[PDB]
A = this chain, B = another copy of it.
């Protein structure tokens, strides 16, 4: 039980690090699409 609990916590804190990367990638993609709307707008 105790090993698997320590396993799960290790896994999940890595998973959170992955999500944090996908989340920063999202913010960058938004700036890129805004890049395109800025050339159209101007």
| CB atoms of B15 and A12 under 8 A apart | yes
**CB-based nearest B residue for A14:** B16
**Total copies of this chain within the assembly:** 3
When distances are taken between beta carbons in the complex, the residues of chain B under 8 Å from A1 are 1-2, 5
Whole-angstrom CA separation of A1 from B1 in the bound complex: 7
When distances are taken between beta carbons in the complex, the residues of chain B under 8 Å from A2 are 1
When distances are taken between beta carbons in the complex, the residues of chain B under 8 Å from A29 are 26, 29-30, 33
Whole-angstrom CA separation of A16 from B33 in the bound complex: 27
What's the minimum C-beta distance from A40 to chain B, rounded to whole angstroms?
7
When distances are taken between beta carbons in the complex, the residues of chain B under 8 Å from A19 are 15, 18-19, 22
**CB-based nearest B residue for A37:** B36
